[PDB]
From a paper:
N6-methyladenosine (m6A) is the most abundant and prevalent internal modification in mRNA. In mammals, m6A exerts pivotal roles in posttranscriptional regulation and its dysregulation is implicated in various diseases including cancer. m6A is installed by a multicomponent methyltransferase complex (MTC, also known as the m6A writer complex). The mammalian MTC is composed of the core m6A methyltransferase METTL3–METTL14 complex (MTC core) and several regulatory proteins including WTAP, the adaptor responsible for METTL3–METTL14 localization and proper substrate recruitment, and VIRMA (KIAA1429), the specificity mediator that mediates preferential m6A modification at the 3′ untranslated regions (UTRs). WTAP and VIRMA are important subunits of the m6A writer complex.
We further purified the METTL3–METTL14–WTAP1–273–VIRMA381–1486 complex for gradient fixation and cryo-EM analysis. Unexpectedly, in the cryo-EM structure, only WTAP171–237 and VIRMA381–1292 (with the stoichiometric ratio 2:1) and an unassigned density close to WTAP were observed. The observed WTAP171–237–VIRMA381–1292 in the quaternary complex adopted a flag-and-pole-like architecture with dimensions of ~116 Å × 103 Å × 80 Å. Two WTAP171–237 molecules (designated WTAPA and WTAPB) formed an asymmetric homodimer (the “flag pole”) while VIRMA381–1292 that contains 17 armadillo-like (ARML) repeats (designated ARML 1–17) formed a twisted α-solenoid-like superhelix (the “flag”). Two long helices in between of ARML 4–5 and of ARML 7–8 mediate the turning of the VIRMA α-solenoid, possibly accounting for the formation of the twisted architecture. However, compared to the WTAPs alone, VIRMA-bound WTAPs bent around the observed N-termini (around WTAPA residue 188 and WTAPB residue 185) and displayed a more compact and dense conformation with distinct intramolecular interactions. Hydrogen bond interactions were also observed between WTAP Q201A side chain and K198B main chain and between N205A main chain and Q201B side chain. These together contributed to the formation of the compact VIRMA-bound WTAP dimer that harbors a contiguous negatively charged surface patch involved in the interaction with VIRMA. Three intermolecular interaction interfaces, designated Interfaces 1, 2, and 3, could be observed between the WTAP171–237 dimer and VIRMA381–1292 with buried areas of ~773.9 Å2, ~1155.6 Å2, and ~101 Å2, respectively. Interface 1 is located in between WTAPA (residues 205–224) and VIRMA (residues 452–660). Interfaces 2 and 3 are in between of WTAPB (residues 177–200, 214–221) and VIRMA (residues 657–1030, 494–497).
Residue numbers in the entry:
A (entry chain A): 381 to 413, 426 to 524, 527 to 578, 617 to 738, 755 to 833, 844 to 1047, 1051 to 1124, 1137 to 1292
B (entry chain B), C (entry chain E): 171 to 237
Write the structure that this text describes.
Amino acid sequence: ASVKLTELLDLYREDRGAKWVTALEEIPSLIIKDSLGQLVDWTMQALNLQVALRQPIALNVRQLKAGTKLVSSLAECGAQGVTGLLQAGVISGLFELLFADHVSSSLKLNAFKALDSVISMTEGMEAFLRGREKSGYQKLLELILLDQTVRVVTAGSAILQKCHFYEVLSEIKRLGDHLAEKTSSNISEGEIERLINLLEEVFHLMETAPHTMIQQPVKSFPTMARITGPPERDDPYPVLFRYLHSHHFLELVTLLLSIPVTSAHPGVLQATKDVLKFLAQSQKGLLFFMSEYEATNLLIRALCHFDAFALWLQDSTQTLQCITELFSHFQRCTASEETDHSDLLGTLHNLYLITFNPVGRSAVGHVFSLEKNLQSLITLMEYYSKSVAYNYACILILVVVQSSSDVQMLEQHAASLLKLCKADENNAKLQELGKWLEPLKNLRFEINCIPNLIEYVKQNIDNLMTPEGVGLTTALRVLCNVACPPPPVEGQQKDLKWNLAVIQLFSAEGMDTFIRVLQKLNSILTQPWRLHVNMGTTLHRVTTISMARCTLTLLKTMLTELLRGGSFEFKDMRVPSALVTLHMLLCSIGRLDSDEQKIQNDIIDILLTFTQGVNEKLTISEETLANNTWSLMLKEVLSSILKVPEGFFSGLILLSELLPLPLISVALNTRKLWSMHLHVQAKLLQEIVRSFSGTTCQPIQHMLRRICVQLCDLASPTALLIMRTVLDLIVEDLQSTSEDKEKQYTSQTTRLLALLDALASHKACKLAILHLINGTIKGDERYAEIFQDLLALVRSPGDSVIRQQCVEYVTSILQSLCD
Amino acid sequence: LGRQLSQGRIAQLEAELALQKKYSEELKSSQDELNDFIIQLDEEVEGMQSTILVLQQQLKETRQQLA
Amino acid sequence: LGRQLSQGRIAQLEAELALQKKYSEELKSSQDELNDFIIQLDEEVEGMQSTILVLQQQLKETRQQLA
């Protein structure tokens, strides 16, 4: 290609016309695989309108369109190209076309793409922002004001959003250098708050980068649903990592974690660990850490001397290094004459040693799930198919397949693994690996394969968490990324494949299958728990957690889109009746663990979709309120809480998580809607308070008090009803003792008075207490009588200890009442 | 009573939904065809835009030549 | 219980219908917006033809001037 490029360049040294335009159009293919000066001189003449005007028909707009493709090709070659382009004046030369008159919107839209490839390197954005004379930033700002079409105001916004990210990293560096070097007074909460605020912008401008910082194809329109465009896109992350490297991001996070003032701050440790967590979830991000390998170790030490993020990062970096070594071994040494070569035995031994602790198997199975890193082990077996290298590879592949949950490597490698497992029928480590990839028999991962996976699960549902039924962990992992989109990001375009996926799920009987999966998983951990297999190995725990998470994600994806805006009703009372028991079994211990907590969040999210789908007009009729999607879910949850003596403390956590936080337009809309539905289940809510009042347990009592406070803070009628219930409990407790004899005070009475004292501290409960004791309601004289009894008890104390607690509680109640 | 109402709901609803699902599919296909038509309309539009820009540029060239 | 099976089957079919109708709505909205963008492109085309006409007319005047 180089020889061809030399011939073309020398032939048209001074030739202009159709031949020159043909050469310009042909060059970009050649450059893929001092001519740079001549190429730069050619590029600046193809962008000149004074040369385009002097050419015949159809040859004048093909010279300008072909001059914006030499920019996108010369800049990507390296810094030596961008430096020459900037020295020639590409920034100013690309703005004489956008500002020019009568230019079509498809040639202006191409000049933006040439500029996006110039400011994509740190040498470029320095010249774009700081003028060389007006800068390019000011020119683009003026260009936005001018009236443009829909696709030109969208292309110019991507350049602006990319410039913002470069200017949030520049202020972080200055702020940190001034914070640490100078002061360490000036280290106040009005200055640290900027650091946490700036570090939440870096995490925000990289999560939304693929959507608001890329240049869309010329034939794509900014619609909220993606239609009429090429399917491919561009990856912005290499540029972002190029900016982070130039600003020395890692050499500064270590500075914030190694300074007397802000290292101890819990809000800065958490803020900087969310950028690092996101950055290490990709192959490009993990390779970013190993580029400056010296600065990564110091960061690990700084994060470590202060929960297992440092250990996980160390394991991931070691795993990636070993994988790179494995790939490099089969390149320099194409043929392995010595099967047991010492270098590869050492590499395999280190990889095997990493996989002992549970935090090591979650990092070995994570790096191997990115790109095509699983090919090294398959190649190592195929070369040798015993050798010791074979055994280690078999063990490592079993580990990766068992542990990893993002099964995208299986869409291409499942063909090799199955035939390799068929080849060796006597190895006990391959007869098990072939059982995991059982559903993946002649399967192509699109929507058309969803019914096959659902059919396989439906058939082999009887064997869950058994040696034979280990293919259900993979048949549910595969089905959970084909049809379940990742969480939405602001600025996205709603792809229409995800609606068809959910339609296919509903057509292939996904609902019943997933309900059966959840029910079967529930009735193993509780009734068949008599075997007391309480996660004896790391397999029984990880497998169960993965199945639970996958089923929950599928259920949430189906129910969110189905019950989106209350268009359609839902009455199947099986989903909000097995999520409670799953919460009791799994989320029983905060939960933490980064996996037990997410299950609770998903359970709450699935339960909450029954409230959003509500009718705001049919809020008066008794039939329309007692048979709503809200009321049925609430009845099922409340009944489920009061069905198992063991399931009380966990149920109160669920009830607390459902209800809104204790005490503008949307705040009152939901709070009063909650009280309207809660009023129907009066007998169910009253049963919670009375049943859990007669027990002795500090966590249970504290949860009960918190729930009472929340329900009182909801709205007024519910608070009054709860106060009626509790004071009626007081009335019956004091009426249980015969008035003929001396009044009997028990520990239950002391607990009840403590409950009244705890409730009375809140103004919302205060108003209800005052309204009830005022006696305005007809038939409200009993509460006045019981208050008079309390006053008489105050006037007539005693010497008993229980009498002492009663007197102190009643005095505290009266003190709160006087306020 | 309730059982007869449920059975009638079952029968008539399943029948008429099965009948009108096909017309819903026809509507989807018609919208897909309309989107295709819009695609070629767009393509023709930018073709005319480029050709017209060529015409203006050669007109301006003749202008600079004559003056 | 007949109610359980009735609600299950009706829920399956009506969920299919509701998801289909949604798909139609956010296809139609996008088509309408794309038609609006096409209208913008046509406005550009007409204005650009207008400047063609103006420049060609002035071409005729300078041609008659040259004689």
